[PDB]
Design a protein around this ligand. Structure first.
Ligand SMILES: COC(=O)c1cccc2c1-c1ccccc1[C@]2(O)C(F)(F)F
Ligand SMILES: COC(=O)c1cccc2c1-c1ccccc1[C@]2(O)C(F)(F)F
Lengths: 343, 343
């Protein structure tokens, strides 16, 4: 075959990071399925090949494991699917129709990658141990691998959702009400918490719009990404709150604050679930230390970092924990954070 | 001379980190000026020579600057002062008396090192620029240099204060009431804030003793170190609170929480001084970016880290900032964090 040839060629190109404003302007009224196809048939192989070349640089002790090999075969096949559209003509409506169906097949093919890499991490711990040098190598690779996967899925979701005057531009809401997303993630976590604990804390939301005290806080963002982060944070904050008060009757509420600054949009989730010692907080974001025979926090941070944001934890052992999602307030600052294969 | 010979010899030894419990047990009833002299005349040259060898490994562009040369001459002279006590006999009371006076002279000799290195950092910015590679090199060296200096001053303070049944063991309070130190640092910052702004926010303290809800929170620590950290944090929180409310009348109070867990003793200082964007928070701990023709935060964190703690900032732009001091709750976990010269 010629899969190594394709990887070597496109890995020389660097991925082109797109801003949130670019996604919005590309997918709005000026959206053209021809233009998106011309861009994607080149950018998708570049992003695929860059992470595929990093996978090849893994030691053969990891490269020859069944988990890495299975995932690498998914990327080879996905890369080859995109290759067949290079010589195709964008002026043919059947060419664009087959390209969209090919993206859906690729998206569903990689749908079960989180438990697969979780199996791979557990295999590495039981084969070579959990030394701190191995954790940093696993953390470094998995962060870049998953962030690369988020960026590829973002491109595919924007194309397939738009080419199928709505208010949503694919997966992007140009008027995303942050408090409403907080409530949705809270309600879902409350339903799970009531079914398993027969008790759940209440929600308190406070907004701080520094520039316009009266106006509700809106932003341009991907609501599903923000939901994912808040949902994982709500589940942890409820689990800790209920378990740390089993012998008590009062159940402290979960307090969420949404602050809109001139540059940052910050979401703080405060719980009183007993807190966690600092020594163990720094391990909650580690794939290796969060794997048992549990990736909500590490992946949630990658979603935050994907558009130049962050997700941070600071706890008070014996009381509770604060979780803060940092997002860019302006669409011009919300640029893709992409891993690039360098030397 | 033979200053390079001494440096090369003692730099092969590694510094011996002492725990807070060791300091307490060494300096209490079983304290012996003979034993402390025997240990210090060996450990002080080892710690001096280790940082002096790292200074020699700096590039000549920095090593030949007047600031580094002036400081290096202080350490050479301080090292030579300790050398004269190697052949001396510990059984002579005049030998121990001259050793204590020599430590006082060394402590006062290095008393003006913070503005000197501040001048050196400004000289580097104006000579070679403020590139991110230079910041990481300056940050890496200054952190280790200052932490080394804190550890040397700690040893000297313990010897000179004890050998001159008190409740304080040198600079260590085995029953340090944390809230009382918070109040002292607050009162000092309030006096400065009223003199310059004619207004100051109020203080609110809440204690959370998880194991003993009724008992006030005590710990074994160095009160002057904790005061220094809280004083710098109070000055920043008051400056931001007053300035961000000049056009307003209500002045939000500064809320401090002291949590005692099974492993951590955490002190959170919450202000509503408008907050800082995340992009600039990460630069507040940088010596290079905090130098203008301002080291309260970087040095305060080193004091926290000195006994296996930390100091962290997380702000909400448009609202306020939380500052958290993490300390070890147990004296057995409060071990010196010392930089060691490796390859
Ligand atoms: C006028 O510009 C475009 O139409 C366009 C141009 C380049 C890339 C894309 C578009 C587009 C439009 C709708 C959905 C997805 C996309 C993209 O594939 C991307 F933004 F996701 F990269
Ligand atoms: C019985 O142990 C000792 O007396 C002792 C032994 C080794 C080192 C020290 C002491 C001691 C005592 C009082 C003040 C300072 C010190 C030390 O120089 C150190 F702890 F600061 F290192």
């Amino acid at each position: 075959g010629s899969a190594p040839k394709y990887i070597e060629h496109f890995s020389k190109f660097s991925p082109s990071p797109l801003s949130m404003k670019q996604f919005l302007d590309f997918g709005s009224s000026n959206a053209c399925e021809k233009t998106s196809f011309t861009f994607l048939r080149q950018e998708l192989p570049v992003r695929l090949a860059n992470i595929m070349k990093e996978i090849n640089l893994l030691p053969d002790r990891v490269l020859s494991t069944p988990s890495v090999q299975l995932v690498q075969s998914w990327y080879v096949q996905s890369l080859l699917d995109i290759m067949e559209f290079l010589d195709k003509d964008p002026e043919d409506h059947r060419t664009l129709s087959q390209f969209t169906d090919a993206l859906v097949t690729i998206r569903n093919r990689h749908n079960d990658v989180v438990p697969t890499m979780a199996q791979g991490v557990l295999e590495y711990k039981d084969t070579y141990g959990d030394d701190p040098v191995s954790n940093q190598n696993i953390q470094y690779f998995l962060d870049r691998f998953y962030l690369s996967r988020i960026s590829i899925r973002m491109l595919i979701n924007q194309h397939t959702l738009i080419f199928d005057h709505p208010k949503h531009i694919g997966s992007i809401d140009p008027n995303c009400n942050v408090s409403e997303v907080v409530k949705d993630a809270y309600d879902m976590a409350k339903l799970l918490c009531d079914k398993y604990y027969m008790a759940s804390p209440d929600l308190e939301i406070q907004e701080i719009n520094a520039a316009n005290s009266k106006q509700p806080i809106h932003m341009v963002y991907v609501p599903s990404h923000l939901y994912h982060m808040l949902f994982e944070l709500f589940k942890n904050a409820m689990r800790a709150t209920v378990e740390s008060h089993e012998s008590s009757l009062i159940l402290p509420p979960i307090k969420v604050m949404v602050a809109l600054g001139e540059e940052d949009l910050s979401i703080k989730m405060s719980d009183r679930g007993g807190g966690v010692p600092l020594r163990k907080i720094e391990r909650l974001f580690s794939y290796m230390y969060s794997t048992a025979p549990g990736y909500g926090l590490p992946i949630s941070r990658l979603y935050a970092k994907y558009f130049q944001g962050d997700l941070q934890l600071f706890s008070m052992e014996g009381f509770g924990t604060d979780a803060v999602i940092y997002l860019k307030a302006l669409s011009t600052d919300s640029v893709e954070r992409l891993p690039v294969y360098n030397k």
